[PDB]
Design a binder for this molecule. Structure first.
Ligand SMILES: Nc1nc2c(ncn2[C@@H]2O[C@H](COP(=O)(O)OP(=O)(O)OP(=O)(O)O)[C@@H](O)[C@H]2O)c(=O)[nH]1
Ligand SMILES: Nc1nc2c(ncn2[C@@H]2O[C@H](COP(=O)(O)OP(=O)(O)OP(=O)(O)O)[C@@H](O)[C@H]2O)c(=O)[nH]1
Ligand SMILES: Nc1nc2c(ncn2[C@@H]2O[C@H](COP(=O)(O)OP(=O)(O)O)[C@@H](O)[C@H]2O)c(=O)[nH]1
Ligand SMILES: Nc1nc2c(ncn2[C@@H]2O[C@H](COP(=O)(O)OP(=O)(O)O)[C@@H](O)[C@H]2O)c(=O)[nH]1
Ligand SMILES: [Mg+2]
Ligand SMILES: [Mg+2]
Lengths: 435, 429, 429, 435
């Protein structure tokens, strides 16, 4: 009765959604065809139901290249999705923000908004939106900027959560990542309620070091991020000793309107062969979450200050142990919050344990904790992008595509100014107060 | 007669209330279906103070459960001891306060408060001679705090004569379960010192420590803490829900414990508290309970009383006992702790005695201390507030609902005025 | 009335106390569960002097078991006669004193001493008319020595009126169970001569010799020695735990045996001591016990009394006997040993008589002699100390906890002052 | 509840640990997989436990050559160890202290300290450390010096016990033993709480003469030293009539801060065929312990003075007999303690008998006694090393490896000076006092 739709833009969004919906169907014992042989309703928040025992997701799959969507239509989760949700374009933006925001996406945006409005009106207690999109791809950035603007125009005050894929400092599959990233950030900065920074480089490191898988496929990273998002929405979708809604997330983790970029982290992540030999203490897993090597963004947290933290626990958890572990974390020195925020934690506890996907890589654990942490180290990452942008702009490289596809140079200058202003605000927050 | 109406705001309020009604029904011998199967007539001699006799000889709690989200409401409804509440009382919203006080007091709450007041009025008219209201809520969560303050203001407008009790879960000193709780706490305290007859400050940290140290439980689930607080409240009301050699009511406690209108914040305590094995190895004597109730390690508010003075003290016993024993114990405890009491209030202990133990035990005791130590709490909060208000963090979330900075300015000024008064009376001479 | 509180410090203290409470319960007919199954009302007429009647008609020892390591504590707790102690009394630390006195009196003990004093105070307030305290400890081990001295100082600060007993296991002359025991012994003696009412010097060497020679046991386990010392202590207290034709208490013994404040160190002795077969072949007559208690081979302190003079002597009998017989025996024994007594104290034998034997026997006897021979002990220790202090061996271990050389200088000076006083009074005229 | 971790550095350390953990698992009836079909908890001090009936050791196996660690991973005790404890390097220091302390070990020391800190924080009543390492090998000396420095920096005042392997006067498998030994001693002299001198030459002699095994393998010596260490920790791990902790060991056996080098000795050691024909009197086994031929360091004790002794008994022992035997020992002339220490004994008694490993070489005995004795004869041994060092330094032999691997000559001169100062202090203690 507290619904929240899902929106998947771009190839990354669609693949992540594949993983996430596999995980959901496993959580609620739902067949790929929508049938089903502590639980409350629970699945009602993400599954709508027809007369028969068939349930459908509240998701929208939009893309400009029909390849991946066609794979979904042919995927084992074929009978699941309502066929109208699979909006396919004809020619992808091809890692060009201009195409993805002015030329191509502009011509299906209306149909996308139509389906969005249909699914919204069919629901009653709509909590908000979940956007799954990359950052470098043309469709992702462009269509996402357009979609966020349209939604903010239409649905003024409702939850809008985003899951970007922060481009890695060194592993850049595309070449024009800085341009698209800068443009999409400069646009989305005034509409997104709360983003969720995740990067593939950190996930590679985590998969190799912890899970002891040397050669991972994209499916594995998708499984990890799906686990994170499932932990995020378990509070809505399940009964817990201390529940929490997305509104609480945006309220607690966003001190200033512009600074709403918290990074993700999850634990425990160990191989099934290594499942034993460790009791998985709640304080232990909390320390694991706070370790710089277990974070999912390549940024040393010791270089910044945790402006806010949100720890969400599920499984056999007891509040006093959580309190003790959090107090111990506060005692440590290298974790220095901002002076003006003495209360740097919101906690969430759930009874439903995390579910391990058969054919997966993780081990069945009795407890799990996801930390969404808004820190100051992320500012440094922006600097890197800044740098690259200047380079690719000092020579006016690649500019002609963007210019000829519905954009002006002054827009690029303005986006650079906006990113510089954001970095300035981050520094301004980083200082301490007098008196 | 003296019918009492129960209000439960916020998730914490609802959970505490569920445990509370469980305890009350257990005291009165009430089946989960809501019908009586008890054994002692005295149970039903005053069943009407908390229950209403619905036709076909059934009983319903005189409670009003309020929320802005269906989650915990439905959780309780599905659970046992849920099918006895009258379903029309379950008022809930859909938007959810989002742990914001502005929503819970200006925008979202303003839409349900009317229906809530209507149900309140219906229940009031059902009662014969209304005694007063007890509100069960938190101070951090947006719904509990905001909507409870709104309802308190409205009720006090509609009932400037009845009595008002609030059981607020004050934020812990060390940990902080949320991030913006200083703002909600400050605004809630503003409204409480405005229009509340008495407020029972309670912390989860102290309950954790009591369960761990005293009861020897390393696995305290929220059910245990809620059970403890519910036992406390039941002990508070048993003085009128049952006969007694020296009976008391809510009005008597308010008269005795509130020398000045604003200074109506109380730290509670309970006794005896024994482990499962370490119980038979101790004598259950009135002096033992009395000495137990006077120490830092058994106060449900995280503040050492030795830091201040006991302005007033109330104590409610249960079960059969000898009055002279209680008198001597109170005399001795007031003599030995001479430095810990206000000079200009001699004999500052109120005593009440019941005839029924809370079941299972021979004799129990409840302590309600109005001290000057608690000011530290407020001081702490005030400081935090100033910090978070100096940089105006999160200020936009509350601004967007119509609230303005001057609201926080006034609330902080009021809190500092209260702190000044508390300190002034601490070192009075 | 005259309630007595028991403290047990160190591993030796705890083991001795466990055996002691076993013996006491056997005397009073107390089941291992802690409930009474005895047969004589006189058992419960004064059960309250050592036990507390917990509700549901149970009994708990009024003891306080203290340690810095959980090992022996848990060992006792698992053992029979362990499940009757009230579990809250088991105060123990985790670091362990490491057989160091500096840790046991400055660093490690300073953290638990507060909780220990709190439990002490609670027990004191439970008692009606407190009589005094008995401390069971060693002098070599770091925990026992250091923490016991600390507690003694604190208690004497909080109770400058009560009476204090210490049962210290003095290091043997020949063997040395540890290496640094001279330092701990010297510091402990310093604190004892500071603030102890009476001290019962006991050696393991003498107990070994008694068990081997007299009782004909070639396999003496520590249980046997602890049983003997516990029998001694029980015989000391039976004069007040039971009626008697000439009753005595701890205060009487302190008055009679301590002519001067510092000279309060006593060597005990017990009788009769017979083998399993060689018992029926001897008459159990008061003269026999009396002559048994006066010889080197039956003193629980390794020092021949003939080397010095008996400054004072106390003797507590049990069971039915004829007073005139005891009087004549004391007269004869004082006449025949004229050279072995102080000139200026005529009739230097205190006599007490009980009505109950220690069970199984017909008549027993306990001797508490304050002699000048024991000075040799101190002399010995002093010499050793000087040696180990001249080269400053192990000095860094004690230095690292804040202690300084001047501490040892003062302690040795004090010990030599005491030795000078003892010798001075030995050859007084 | 009084935990004490184990650290095994170098090949010797790892093999000794294999033997020791075999012995422990036999003591507490623990399967190699951590399952189990007078005892208290007992095993809690060295075994941690997870939810299931599976227990793991509190040990760390660190090496720079993966050979032996891989053997462990393939050993019958495979399921026992938590896989993270098996830290393996890539290239061994190759009997070079410089490599083991400056170049290679410097790059895994942080991970080792991390695992140490994890295991420490998981424990509550940590008594201290047990280091198992050789003296000649590069990894042993170098990594051990580094580890001791790091631990002393981090864990200031906690028990730190070491089990070095003193290089034999004549049987030297390596060639550069004096250099590494001098360096590691000069370094560890300021950090180690208490060492434990043992040598392979003496163990060879004992195995041949007493056990009547002419051709022993390293496994046998490892079994012997494991028995010694088990006797050392039995007081913590079992109930005894007079218990003793490691703090007591360091307090009693260390008169002066620098002089903390007690040598080991154990008894009874007889063949099972010779188990009969001798009743194993407690005084008899005490005399056996005090015989110069039963000691485990090739140094005639009659050439020095026992500054301190610590006799630890287990099995069917009675205190009076111990007292009598110790008095008789004190009566004898050839055992001349220092005049200034008249009390040269600390005693420990345990009820648990020593356990004989099936497939072993010793016989089931009802009583056993381990003597840790700090004497003055050990000084002479240093002299020998001194001599050799001077030789290998008079010609500057082998110097170039150490120089080129992160060291300076003045450091060698300083180490020689420090060893000379230690020998001088030993002589100074050896004298008698006036007045
Ligand atoms: N974490 C994760 N990222 C993915 C996955 N698949 C694709 N991506 C991201 O997708 C990016 C590739 O460009 P996309 O954003 O997918 O471009 P697109 O979605 O195809 O849209 P167009 O640019 O218009 O073609 C890479 O930078 C990846 O980070 C995946 O399975 N997991
Ligand atoms: N007592 C005993 N000593 C051993 C055993 N195995 C090896 N050693 C010792 O190990 C030494 C050989 O050099 P190590 O110290 O092992 O060198 P390492 O541990 O391999 O480290 P690197 O020098 O870097 O290779 C020899 O002097 C032996 O004394 C064993 O099984 N028992
Ligand atoms: N003592 C106690 N406190 C609780 C319990 N459940 C929630 N709380 C407290 O309630 C606060 C959350 O407020 P909540 O009612 O959930 O948020 P709201 O919906 O905005 O009113 C937290 O600070 C918790 O400390 C409980 O069972 N016992
Ligand atoms: N008579 C006797 N003495 C004991 C017994 N157990 C230990 N001791 C003595 O206690 C001393 C050890 O002190 P201990 O309490 O164990 O060390 P601590 O922990 O530092 O106080 C030794 O000198 C022993 O002689 C016992 O059962 N009987
Ligand atoms: Mg694409
Ligand atoms: Mg090696």
């Amino acid at each position: 009765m507290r619904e929240c739709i899902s929106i998947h833009v771009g190839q990354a969004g669609v693949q992540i959604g594949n993983a996430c919906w596999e995980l959901y169907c496993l959580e609620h014992g739902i067949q790929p065809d929508g049938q089903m042989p502590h639980h409350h309703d629970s699945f009602n928040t993400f599954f709508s139901e027809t007369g028969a025992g068939k349930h459908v997701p509240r998701a929208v799959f939009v893309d400009l290249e029909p390849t991946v969507i066609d794979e979904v239509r042919t995927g084992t989760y074929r009978q699941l999705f309502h066929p109208e949700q699979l909006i396919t374009g004809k020619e992808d933006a091809a890692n060009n923000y201009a195409r993805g925001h002015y030329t191509i996406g502009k011509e299906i945006i209306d149909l996308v908004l139509d389906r969005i409005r249909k699914l919204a009106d069919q629901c009653t207690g709509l909590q908000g939106f979940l956007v799954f999109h990359s950052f470098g791809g043309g469709t992702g950035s462009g269509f996402t900027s357009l979609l966020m603007e349209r939604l903010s125009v239409d649905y003024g005050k409702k939850s809008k959560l985003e899951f970007s894929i922060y481009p890695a400092p060194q592993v850049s599959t595309a070449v024009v990542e800085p341009y698209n990233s800068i443009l999409t950030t400069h646009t989305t900065l005034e509409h997104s309620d709360c983003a969720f920074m995740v990067d593939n480089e950190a996930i590679y490191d985590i998969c190799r070091r912890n899970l002891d898988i040397e050669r991972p496929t994209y499916t594995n990273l998708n499984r990890l991020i799906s686990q994170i998002v499932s932990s995020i929405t378990a509070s809505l979708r399940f009964d817990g000793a201390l529940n929490v809604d997305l509104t609480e997330f945006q309220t607690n983790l966003v001190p200033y309107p512009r600074i709403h970029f918290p990074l993700a982290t999850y634990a425990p992540v160990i191989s099934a062969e290594k499942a034993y030999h460790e009791q998985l203490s709640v304080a232990e897993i909390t320390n694991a979450c706070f370790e710089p090597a277990n974070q999912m963004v390549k940024c040393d947290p010791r270089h910044g200050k945790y402006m806010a933290c949100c720890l969400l626990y599920r499984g056999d958890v007891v509040p006093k142990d959580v309190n003790a572990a959090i107090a111990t974390i506060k005692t440590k020195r290298s974790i220095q919050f901002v002076d003006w925020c003495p209360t740097g934690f919101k906690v969430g506890i759930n009874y439903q344990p995390p579910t391990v996907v058969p054919g997966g890589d993780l081990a069945k654990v009795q407890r799990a904790v996801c930390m969404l942490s808004n820190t100051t180290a992320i500012a440094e990452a922006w600097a890197r992008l800044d740098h690259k942008f200047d380079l690719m702009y000092a020579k006016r490289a690649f500019v002609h595509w963007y210019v000829g596809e519905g954009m002006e140079e002054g827009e690029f200058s303005e986006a650079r100014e906006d990113m510089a202003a954001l970095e300035k605000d981050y520094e301004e927050v980083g200082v301490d107060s007098v008196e | 007669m003296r019918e009492i109406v129960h209000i439960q705001a916020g998730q914490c309020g609802n959970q505490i209330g569920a445990k509370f009604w469980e305890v009350i029904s257990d005291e009165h011998g009430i089946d989960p279906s809501g019908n009586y199967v008890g054994d002692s007539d005295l149970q039903l001699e005053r069943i009407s103070v908390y229950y209403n006799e619905a036709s076909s000889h059934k009983y319903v709690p005189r409670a009003i459960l309020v929320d802005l989200e269906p989650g915990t409401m439905d959780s309780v409804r599905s659970g046992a001891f849920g099918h006895l509440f009258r379903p029309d009382n379950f008022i809930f919203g859909q938007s959810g306060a989002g742990n914001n006080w502005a929503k819970g007091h200006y925008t979202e709450g303003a839409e349900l408060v009317d229906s809530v007041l209507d149900v309140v009025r219906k229940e009031c008219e059902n009662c014969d001679c209304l005694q007063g209201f007890q509100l069960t809520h938190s101070l951090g969560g947006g719904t509990g705090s905001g909507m409870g303050t709104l309802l308190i203001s409205k009720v006090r407008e509609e009932y400037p004569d009845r009595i008002m009790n609030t059981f607020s879960v004050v934020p812990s000193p060390k940990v902080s379960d949320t991030v913006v709780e200083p703002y909600n706490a400050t605004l809630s305290i503003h409204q409480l010192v405005e229009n509340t007859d008495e407020t029972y400050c309670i912390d989860n940290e102290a309950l954790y420590d009591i369960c761990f140290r005293t009861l020897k439980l390393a696995t305290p689930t929220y059910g245990d803490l809620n059970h403890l607080v519910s036992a406390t409240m039941s002990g508070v009301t048993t003085s009128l829900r049952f006969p007694g050699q020296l009976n008391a009511d809510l009005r008597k406690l308010a008269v005795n414990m509130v020398p000045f209108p604003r200074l109506h914040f109380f730290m509670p305590g309970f006794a005896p508290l024994t482990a499962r094995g370490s119980q038979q190895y101790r004598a259950l004597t009135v002096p033992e309970l009395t000495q137990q109730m006077f120490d830092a390690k058994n106060m449900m508010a995280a503040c050492d009383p030795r830091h201040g003075r006991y302005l007033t003290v109330a104590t409610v016993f249960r079960g059969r006992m000898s009055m002279k024993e209680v008198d001597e114990q109170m005399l001795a405890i007031q003599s030995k702790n001479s430095s810990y009491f206000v000079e200009w209030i001699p004999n500052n202990v109120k005593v009440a005695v019941c005839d029924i133990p809370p079941r299972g035990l021979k004799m129990s005791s409840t302590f309600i201390g109005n001290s000057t130590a608690i000011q530290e709490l407020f001081k702490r909060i005030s400081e935090q507030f100033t910090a978070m208000f100096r940089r105006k963090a999160f200020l936009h979330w509350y601004t967007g609902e119509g609230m303005d900075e001057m609201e926080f300015t006034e609330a902080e000024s009021n809190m500092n005025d209260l702190v000044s008064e508390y300190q002034q009376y601490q070192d009075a001479t």
